[PDB]
Symmetry: D2
Subunit: 254 residues, 4 copies
């Protein structure tokens, strides 16, 4: 199943879409600067692009830590991103009440991996009618992603993206099961499957190998972060390699 996001066709047999950006919104000028770089690089490479950022870090290690800009100021920044660049954007939501006002602005809304079982958040996200990115919890098997998809379907929203981010492997370590991509395609109606390489890693060399490995299994998209996280100036070289492999894979019959 393909999903149209403005002029972008997202699907497992279409050219990969980059969901790219930053950890958290810190200010307007820093955000526009980073986004400008992503847009310019992806445009010349001919890679469809959706800008990603969080307005709030809801689970840092300290209560005093910087959470980022917060919701009200966050949305304002997303409005300016879309107007200047004409691209879609994606952000996560942590509380049911945030969903409709966030969805008015942000094209894709994202279910955090920790909150996948928060049924009210799921229903509140579903009702908005927006495209939803489902972060696959590290403690959930790929065969059970269908259970989350079921809930969104019953709440009336079938515009769902499935986002791999690794699986718990002993204590404090993740492994990405490359068979899980196919299992999700087969059991969830071939909904778009994307790969969050950045959060899978918890590394410029290893991030490239892991991204290539994942995209080799024929995916709708790649999800990642940079900091002015991949180093920002290596994005173009990184992406040339990913596009090379994606173009090759996508040109082979299934």
């Amino acid at each position: 199943m393909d999903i149209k996001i403005n002029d972008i066709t997202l699907g497992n047999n279409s050219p990969f879409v980059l969901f790219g950006g930053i950890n958290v919104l810190e200010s307007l000028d820093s955000t526009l600067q980073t986004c400008a770089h992503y847009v310019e690089v992806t445009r010349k490479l001919g890679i469809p692009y959706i800008f990603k950022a969080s307005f709030d870090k809801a689970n840092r290690s300290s209560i005093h830590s910087y959470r980022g800009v917060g919701l009200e100021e966050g949305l304002k920044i997303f409005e300016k991103v879309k107007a200047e660049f004409g691209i879609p954007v994606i952000t996560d939501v942590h509380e049911p009440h945030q969903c409709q006002p966030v969805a008015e602005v942000c094209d894709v809304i994202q279910l955090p991996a920790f909150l996948a079982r928060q049924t009210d958040l799921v229903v509140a996200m579903a009702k908005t009618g927006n495209v939803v990115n489902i972060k696959k919890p590290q403690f959930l098997s790929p065969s059970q992603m269908k259970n989350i998809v079921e809930k969104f379907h019953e709440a009336g929203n079938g515009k769902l993206i499935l986002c791999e981010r690794g699986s718990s492997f002993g204590y404090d370590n993740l492994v990405v099961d490359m068979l899980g991509f196919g299992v999700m395609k087969q059991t969830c109606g071939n909904l778009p499957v994307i790969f969050d390489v950045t959060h899978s890693l918890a590394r410029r060399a290893q991030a490239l190998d892991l991204a290539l490995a994942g995209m080799a299994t024929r995916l709708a998209g790649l999800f990642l972060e940079s900091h002015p996280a991949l180093p920002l100036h290596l994005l173009e070289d990184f992406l040339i390699r990913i596009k090379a492999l994606d173009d090759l894979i996508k040109s082979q019959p299934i």
Copy 2:
């Protein structure tokens, strides 16, 4: 560190406390019935007992499964349980704004495993000043619990219980690392540690072995979501034996 819960002493060197009841609150009559059974078995054996139920469960099997009677009616049901039986009660909260009113009635407030890192909920729970049960997420190692504990301490509350419920083991399955209990005690200042055997088997004779194994490591309590007597006779026997001996010299 011991925690006093009304007339109950909860701690890793004290007789174990049973935490148990029902999944979601339905009605005064249904609650009193299930609670009655727990109370009669525990009183018969002299086991301290804290009744558990959810007034509004956010983590549901399906979208339209009953969430429970809700805040207002739930707290009224809890007040009657306390008045009728003279026991403490425990309930989960998942909304920051609900912590204060729940805390007027519920002796222990429980932080759901999935929300264990939500700073806003932690802070709102901490600010009640109530005893708090922290459920250890299955994706978190026992040495990471001290970070949650630290966030509660920052927010002004040290009356914390740590609750084991298993760790992710490959696909679909949870394993309980019997060594995790000791790591939690050593790293978190010997806070009371309790064992949620029921949700350690999430997604029985089996359960008896697991419960006995956990309690052998010297724990403040046992957490059941629900034979009862035969089970409790066995846990109490092991618990009295273990607690009656001093720690390794």
Copy 3:
């Protein structure tokens, strides 16, 4: 099913048997020194005891490290151990041809966990007719022990002990699934199940060993396997717990 090893009854509803000794045999004198201690402590606590040691370090740190005394000298020391103390002994075997010569002297022969699927070794060990301790591999479901038991039974040997040593938990780490003891009893005809606390690992580390040992023995097991007065203090508590568990109806 109980197994008789001389005057010892080994079984999941009998008093636990301690299997204890040293990693690798170096000298007769240090071997008799260590065994005498175990025998002194277990006797005064009333715990049946089987002395364990390897005649060979199969995996060495270096290709230049000392291997131990080897089979010939190893078996000589085991004979001295048996004559002097009058207890059963247990050792591991790594090659099929070693089985019958080792079995002549050693009461229990042990199948290492990583060799558990080696059919040649299984068959050779089975043909000795000796009591066999099967170490459960660290990747294997407990219900899959059934398949190893089946091979021994097909090779004509039913005197099998099942030994838990932990399961792989990410890289370089082990976890012991306390539910697996029951599964092994239920699926493998209630053969004796014992717990190798020492290898399942990896007041400090001695505290960890006690907690783990107590947790396992709470599930009702035939024995416990190991490698100021620390053994004493440890065994006093295990025996207290074991006596309690074994006095309860199943």
Copy 4:
């Protein structure tokens, strides 16, 4: 570091080598028929090829299932394969005494994963001076492979290949950590790394797993056929080769 195997160059920056054949040597004529098919397909596509089989399967489903033709007859069959097709062959050894007679015939000798820490077998293998394929045990981490490598180096042999076969993941299951290849490359002196996709699967699955692994830049791919169906080999190798050619044609970043 590259390794020369007759006229084949095996290395993490060379065109991938297929290590392929069958589980157990059961027969002469069948082994040759199967080998003939691998040869025809790999020659058609220009893919370097090493024939694989076990003559003595130590780990078997039942105690009396056929272990294989055994050493003497198995080495005769390997000799016939080399003579007929002019290709190198690979096989595993289980005991030190097998190392010499096997190394005399076979171009690569393989250390089974479950025996990978048997010091006696490692030394005996090293001392043949033969090219050795070291199977990574499922219960071992990638940064521990250097310890097996060091034991071989101490015994005088550096012609080593490292073979990924997956890692234990919960009960009765394997996951392949795609990051392990790089760890093994960096910590073991960039020795050739190959991927045993057959035994990594606890198929469209085999193809996905193989493509993923080969995207990380590897010296080779190790598989068995009947286990993949034998007549679908060409289609499979066409896809592997396409990815490998692309990856290898770009300089490392």
